[PDB]
Design a protein around this ligand. Structure first.
Ligand code: HEA
Ligand code: HEA
Ligand SMILES: [Cu+2]
Ligand SMILES: [Cu+2]
Ligand SMILES: [Cu+2]
Ligand SMILES: [Mg+2]
Ligand code: NA
Lengths: 58, 79, 43, 261, 514, 47, 84, 227, 79, 84
């Protein structure tokens, strides 16, 4: 392959005020939002299950 | 030859609070003696001792299940 | 430890109220459940 | 609030800890839904958010070190202690399982036939596949060492080559172990013998997979030149972890496969 | 932005604050649970109706106070806030990971709450011993939910231990040796070592309990050749260390408080003090079986365990005497915090002596599982850990907030709690000697008086905690900001003012290599 | 970053109004203390 | 047994390469040859309904809840005996 | 058994329990000593205006406060171990009785000669005859000959239980699949009560143990009348 | 019941070239059976088997010395 | 057992001095206390002329050639039985 590390150093050191988890571009953002969505959605889902199970369902 | 038996006496092989082996061993030993004496045309009256001891120490339920197991041939101990 | 005087002093009356509200938030909900223990026990 | 004059790393606020914490909630309760209300959705969602979190968290660590240069010598030294301490707790984790094993096999109960292995159990032969597994893992302890040295000497081709061999060896062990699991005449439900055998070697087996992907990560980072001949902590940790996995196996082999059968 | 700051934090101070808040909340849950216990036992007969609810309550009480109140407050709260400040560090070694240690706690607590809500809850005792905890006597998700809560809490603290040890060892001023770090820092380092080594054995143990309930393994089921006693060994191998983990940070705080309010530059016998905590930490790993004296172990091993358990009093003795030696000749300030510390020194001594009685396996036969042991651990935990937690809290509260408490109210608070707890637990020594078992929801008529007095003492303490909530309100409501603090020369944490800025030690301290 | 600093500013709750604080504290500790009692009730109400 | 292959079992990437290809890998081939010049097939064990085996205190949360995860019909009997 | 407003141990019915009472008196004497010493010192330290805030030499007194406690501990341990060994002492019993804990009652088995077995349940407070003890009465007591060395073997058929009888100085856990041995010996006839001492579920508080000690002669007839 | 004995048959407990234990064990077992059957008032005809086996396998000299030892009470085996 | 005394079991002469006097030496005192609060005297073993003991295929090249080097009359019998 070829060494393109220096090029990525520049992209990430660029003073754009972005935190490292987003500094990489537009994709970091979609991943981030996908992750947060599943976590919150799933958390809501689990709370619901906890509720159903809390009551005798049989 | 003892039948003036009060109860299983102290056995140095099993000197501590845990007597699980004492019951177990005497139960095995008996059935092994009984088998030998019955398999070589002899007297089981020798095997008596062990039955008294294991009878004194072993919980009823253990003895019942072990017997049932021996009947169905799933007794894990080598008799 | 030395301090400036209170920026928004809590007069005795204000304290009395604050103490009252606090105690109540601890005693009421539990008193309600406890009072009704029978109503739940009998099923 | 000036320019910092210490060599440490102040990390940008990150959502990954929250996300990872939530993942843990999803997996455990997902496991609870699976075990009792026979459903895998929650567990599946949990597994997914967990990978996403590990991927992004470690991605950032790379960004912060390789790309932003925050890993000064002080920071690295910290990372070393962290890794070691982590391995130590893993050792104690496995110690619980060796305790269980030794406890059961040294004092076999009446319900087992009062002997070890329990009557009815047909243990594997340690001179067959288990000997093989042993030689495969130790051999990868040797190739990973060659990898390390190639790296320190700046030899990119050999580092990649040695790293590759190490990896195929670890993959090979996984396949062999999986085959043995299938071929084995006893199961996890076969009393304390099957219990002890499968959770101890099962967890080790799980660690061999974790170490392999860790090394796979190191492989790709090397393909992209992330490592310099002097700064390559990700690899060192990958290697230490690999030797731990190697050693734990040696104990399983001697204890459970050899002595315990 | 509330988010970036409070949910995505990487600041040791904000995380420490989060822990103090969580721990304060959990303490209310735990206190409520302790009152339901005494409510049931405050009059002959049954109050709750079914004794499984009682058992569920007794269990929850223990987990909440231990895992969700004491540890988060002492280690997560005071640990994160003070450790970096006392050694001149910018933050912890792994500030992002540190945030996960905290966020693993709410989910963990949720699972514990969920366990008592589904099915009939887990009425197993905090020891959650099998077969009672097995899938036969406790079928359903409850015990499994309990096990998972414990996994998360374990992961949280293991990760925390790695952080504290790394930080304390790697991030001090280049010239400062370990023998120049304050005692609290040492106390939290030793505790972290204990957590690192003990928590994983617990995790292994409860994972085996989990597979027995759901994967048909038989580690603890005799049917498959397992042994319920194996569980006990693994659990308590973690369990004794745990009790020392709950008190060590407190030993640290008490040393700082006694030193400060006596007007001394340093505690007496600093190295004897370091030696003592290491010794306690070490010996704390080889005495576990004193919790299993009625289980049927060989007499020789029982003699070993009582002998070993007793040597722990020697190093503990040098600490008690060193605290007293610190007071010697001091210019004493009778502040609330100092009051809490004096109470600790005495109460802890009582509770520890009582533990020496129980160390005797011969005597423990008749005391084991009676209220005499409940009296012991409540002296060292409810009047040890908690008293340290209160002294440390009123002492450093101004550093955390920038505001001061109303000292008179604080003293009123101490006085009430001092009465409440003694009234509650002292009588229980009688119950135990006279034979009252633990974990009972009702008792033979003869034990009525003491149980009655005891339940009454528990309401006095209730008053004290309600009062405390008010005290915090009034401090924040009045807003008396701090001006000057005494003895900053030997108390670094205060040097950056109250409260210290978000980022402290942006420029390191300067320490000569003389 | 540009987070605010000083007394009453390093906390996740506003302390600018003593009476609104009274309410939040009340809810906070209150819900905490109340939880066990409602769980016991919940359990008594299934059977 | 024991061990002693002359010297150089330390220092030099060339040395570790040497050990990798001259000792490690060959050992793997030998154990592979052995593990295949021995590994054929163990006749499936006689089924006897011991109570300390084929444990079932709670059904597995998958399949029909009576089959272990890597169930192998040829060698793993159900609690009632072999399958087919 | 325990009486209202009791402070210490129940009166000793056996010789080891006597031994324990005395050993406890000994230990308590010491805990009073230490605890009173610590309180006197604390009050001494807090009652003077004299100050000495400069540094004091560490080591010097540290030896007194290390050696002394070491001596005191040896004074508690010697006796402790002596008794510990007596309790396990090689006894030669004249009867063996087994007890099996169950979820919510104890069952007894005397099987040296016969196959005598019976369950022992707590007598509900609503079926108590006047003068009977509320949560302590059992319908079928465990009768044993007074003044003899009985060997008790404890186990359980379900969860853990603990067979205890304070007055006699006994507590042995009942563990499934395990037979634990303890040695009983009463020096007086009478009724002696105890209670399950290991949480076993919902009715852990309601499965007492009542021992009835009478002369041999009466034990034998009772055995036969029980089948 | 065998007296149609040709010689000690193959014994899976001692499957290798070294048969030292085979002789030893059977010698022991016999004297132990003999003692039990004589000590519990029974038939030694059960103990016969072992004597035939140990007699076939044990060298004369070993048997002689072991007997002499038992006589003087210096026989190391626990009979 | 196990072990874990907090940290600092490495680096610094002060640290090793600390371990020497705070852990090593105290262990020796404890084991000394034990080895003396236990070590009294084993009653001399009953003499039985086993042939696999008190071996004499060639006389010792010292004394009367029938006494082992650190012969202790109270506990070491000659082949003929105890001395006095
Ligand atoms: C803060 C936690 C804490 C601490 C610090 C300790 C400290 C001690 N505890 Fe205990 N203990 C618990 C909390 C704690 N414990 C808990 C929770 C349980 C019950 C768990 C359960 O089953 O649920 C328990 C139970 C427990 C048992 C089990 C009894 C039974 O179940 O039957 C035993 C047995 O030995 C014991 C002993 C000790 C000892 C010897 C000390 C020693 O560390 C004390 C040393 C202190 C002193 C000795 C006082 C100061 C010293 C001096 C002034 C010097 C002079 C002293 C002498 C010469 C004697 N404790
Ligand atoms: C840290 C440990 C801890 C604490 C503090 C307590 C506190 C209390 N406990 Fe205990 N308890 C245990 C842990 C603890 N307990 C354990 C382990 C068991 C055994 C469980 C089992 O058997 O399985 C037990 C069991 C137990 C029993 C035995 C039950 C039985 O055997 O049936 C009893 C009975 O009276 C009891 C009562 C009390 C009471 C009245 C309080 C009261 O003191 C409550 C009063 C309130 C406080 C003393 C604390 C207030 C502090 C705060 C609110 C935090 C403040 C916050 C900040 C400043 C940031 N508890
Ligand atoms: Cu302990
Ligand atoms: Cu019970
Ligand atoms: Cu019980
Ligand atoms: Mg118990
Ligand atoms: Na009650």
């Amino acid at each position: 392959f070829e060494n393109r590390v220096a090029e990525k150093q520049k992209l990430f050191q660029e003073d754009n005020g972005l935190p490292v988890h987003l500094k990489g571009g537009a994709t970091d953002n979609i991943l981030y939002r996908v992750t947060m969505t599943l976590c919150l959605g799933g958390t809501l889902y689990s709370l619901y299950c906890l509720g159903w199970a809390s009551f005798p369902h049989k | 030859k003892i039948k003036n038996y009060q109860t299983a006496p102290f056995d140095s092989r099993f000197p501590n609070q845990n007597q699980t082996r004492n019951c177990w061993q005497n139960y095995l030993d008996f059935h092994r003696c009984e088998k030998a004496m019955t398999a070589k045309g002899g007297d089981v009256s020798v095997c008596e001792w062990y039955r008294r001891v294991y009878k004194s120490l072993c919980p009823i339920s253990w003895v019942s299940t072990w017997d049932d197991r021996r009947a169905e041939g799933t007794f894990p101990g080598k008799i | 430890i030395t301090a400036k005087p209170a920026k928004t002093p809590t007069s005795p009356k204000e304290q009395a109220i604050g103490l009252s509200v606090t105690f109540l938030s601890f005693l009421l909900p539990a008193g309600w459940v406890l009072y009704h223990l029978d109503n739940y026990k009998k099923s | 609030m000036t320019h910092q004059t210490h060599a440490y790393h102040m990390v940008n606020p990150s959502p990954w800890p929250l996300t990872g914490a939530l993942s843990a909630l999803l997996m455990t309760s997902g496991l609870t839904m699976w075990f009792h209300f026979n459903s895998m959705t929650l567990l599946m969602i949990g597994l997914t958010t967990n990978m996403l979190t590990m991927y992004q968290w470690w991605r950032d660590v790379i960004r912060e070190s390789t790309f932003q240069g925050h890993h000064t010598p002080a920071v690295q030294k910290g990372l070393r202690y962290g890794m070691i301490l982590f391995i130590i707790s893993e050792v104690l984790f496995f110690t619980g399982f060796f305790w269980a094993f030794y406890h059961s096999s040294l004092a076999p109960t009446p319900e087992l036939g009062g002997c070890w292995p329990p009557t009815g159990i047909h243990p594997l032969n340690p001179l067959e596949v288990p000997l093989l597994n042993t030689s495969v893992l130790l051999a990868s302890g040797v190739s990973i060492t060659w990898a390390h040295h190639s790296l320190m000497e700046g030899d990119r081709k050999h580092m990649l080559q040695a790293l590759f061999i190490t990896i195929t060896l670890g993959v090979y062990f996984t396949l062999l172990q999986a085959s043995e699991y299938y071929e084995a005449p006893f199961t996890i439900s076969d009393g304390v013998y099957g219990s002890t055998f499968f959770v101890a070697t099962g967890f080790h087996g799980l660690h061999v997979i974790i170490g392999s992907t860790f090394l796979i990560v190191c492989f790709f980072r090397q393909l992209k030149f992330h490592f310099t001949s002097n700064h390559h902590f990700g690899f060192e940790a990958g290697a230490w972890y690999w030797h731990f996995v190697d050693v734990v196996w040696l104990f399983l082999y001697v204890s459970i496969y050899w002595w315990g059968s | 932005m509330f988010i970036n700051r409070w949910l995505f934090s990487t600041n040791h101070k904000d995380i420490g604050t989060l822990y103090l808040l969580f721990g304060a909340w959990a303490g209310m849950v735990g206190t409520a649970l302790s009152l339901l216990i005494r409510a049931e036992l405050g009059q002959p007969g049954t109050l709750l109706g079914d004794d499984q609810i009682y058992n569920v309550v007794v269990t929850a009480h223990a987990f909440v106070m231990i895992f969700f109140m004491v540890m988060p407050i002492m280690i997560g709260g005071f640990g994160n806030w003070l450790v970096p400040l006392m050694i001149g560090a910018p933050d912890m070694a792994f500030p992002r990971m540190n945030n996960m240690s905290f966020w693993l706690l709410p989910p963990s607590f949720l699972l514990l709450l969920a366990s008592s809500m589904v099915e009939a809850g887990a009425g197993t005792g905090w020891t959650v011993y099998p077969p009672l905890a097995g899938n036969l006597a406790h079928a359903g998700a409850s015990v499994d939910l309990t096990i998972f809560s414990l996994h998360l809490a374990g992961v949280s603290s293991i990760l925390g231990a790695i952080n504290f040890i790394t930080t304390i060892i790697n991030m001090k001023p280049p010239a400062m040796s370990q023998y120049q770090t304050p005692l609290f820092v040492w106390s939290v380092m030793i505790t972290a070592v204990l957590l690192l080594l003990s928590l994983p054995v617990l995790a292994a143990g409860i994972t085996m309990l989990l597979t027995d309930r759901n994967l048909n393994t038989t580690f603890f089921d005799p049917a498959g050749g397992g042994d319920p006693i194996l569980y006990q060994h693994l659990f308590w191998f973690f369990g004794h260390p745990e009790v020392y983990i709950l008190i060590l940070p407190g030993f640290g705080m008490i040393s700082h408080i006694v030193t400060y309010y006596s007007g001394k530059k340093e505690p007496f016998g600093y190295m004897g003090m370091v030696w003592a905590m290491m010794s306690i930490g070490f010996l704390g790993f080889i005495v576990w079986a004193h919790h299993m004296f009625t289980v049927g172990m060989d007499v020789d091993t029982r003699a070993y365990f009582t002998s070993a358990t007793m040597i722990i009093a020697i190093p503990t003795g040098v600490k008690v005497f060193s605290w007293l030696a610190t007071l010697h000749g001091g210019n004493i300030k009778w502040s609330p915090a100092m009051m809490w510390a004096l109470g600790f020194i005495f109460l802890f001594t009582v509770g520890g002596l009582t533990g020496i009685v129980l160390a005797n396996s011969s005597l423990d036969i008749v005391l084991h599982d009676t209220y005499y042991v409940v009296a012991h651990f409540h002296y060292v935990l409810s009047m040890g850990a908690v008293f340290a937690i209160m002294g440390g809290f009123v002492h450093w509260f101004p550093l955390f907030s920038g505001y001061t408490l109303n000292d008179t109210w604080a003293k009123i608070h101490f006085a009430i709690m001092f009465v409440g707890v003694n009234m509650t637990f002292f009588p229980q020594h009688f119950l135990g000697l006279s034979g009252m078992p633990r974990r009972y929801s009702d008792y033979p008529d003869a034990y009525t008086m003491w149980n009655t007095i005891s339940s009454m003492g528990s309401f006095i303490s209730l008053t004290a905690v309600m009062l405390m909530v008010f005290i915090i309100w009034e401090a924040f409501a009045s807003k008396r900001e701090v001006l000057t603090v005494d003895l900053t020369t030997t108390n670094l944490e205060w040097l950056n003012g109250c409260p210290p800025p978000y980022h402290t030690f942006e420029e390191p301290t300067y320490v000569n290599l003389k | 970053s540009h987070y605010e600093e000083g007394p009453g500013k390093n906390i996740p709750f506003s302390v600018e109004n003593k009476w609104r604080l009274l309410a939040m504290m009340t809810l906070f500790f209150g819900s905490g203390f109340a939880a066990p009692f409602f769980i016991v009730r919940h359990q008594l109400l299934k059977k | 047994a024991s061990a002693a292959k002359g010297d150089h079992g330390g220092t030099g990437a060339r040395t570790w390469r040497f050990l990798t290809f001259g000792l490690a890998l060959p050992s793997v081939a030998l154990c592979t040859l052995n593990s295949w010049l021995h590994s054929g097939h163990r006749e499936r064990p006689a089924f006897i309904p011991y109570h300390h085996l084929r444990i079932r205190t709670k059904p597995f949360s998958w399949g029909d809840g009576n089959h272990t995860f890597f169930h192998n019909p040829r060698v793993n009997p159900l609690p009632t005996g072999y399958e087919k | 058994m325990a009486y209202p407003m009791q402070l210490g141990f129940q009166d000793a019915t056996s010789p080891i329990m006597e031994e324990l009472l005395h050993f406890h008196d000994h230990t308590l004497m010491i805990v009073f000593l230490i605890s009173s010493l610590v309180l006197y010192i604390i009050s001494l330290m807090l009652t003077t205006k004299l100050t000495h805030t400069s540094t004091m030499d560490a080591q010097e007194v540290e030896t007194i406060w290390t050696i002394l406690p070491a001596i005191i501990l040896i004074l508690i341990a010697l006796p402790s171990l002596r008794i510990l060994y007596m309790m396990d002492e090689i006894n030669n019993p004249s009867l063996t009785v087994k007890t099996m804990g169950h979820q919510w009652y104890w069952s007894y088995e005397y099987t040296d000669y016969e196959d005598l077995s019976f369950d022992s349940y707590m007598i509900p407070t609503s079926e108590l005859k006047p003068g009977e003890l509320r949560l302590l009465e059992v319908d079928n007591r465990v009768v044993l000959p007074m003044e003899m060395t009985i060997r008790m073997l404890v186990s359980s058929e379900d969860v853990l239980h603990s067979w205890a009888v304070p007055s006699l100085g006994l507590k042995t856990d009942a563990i499934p699949g395990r037979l634990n041995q303890t040695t009983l010996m009463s020096s007086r006839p009478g009724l002696y009560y105890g209670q399950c001492s290991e949480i076993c579920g919902s009715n852990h508080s309601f499965m007492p143990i009542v021992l009835e000690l009478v002369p041999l002669k009466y034990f034998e007839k009772w055995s036969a009348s029980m089948l």
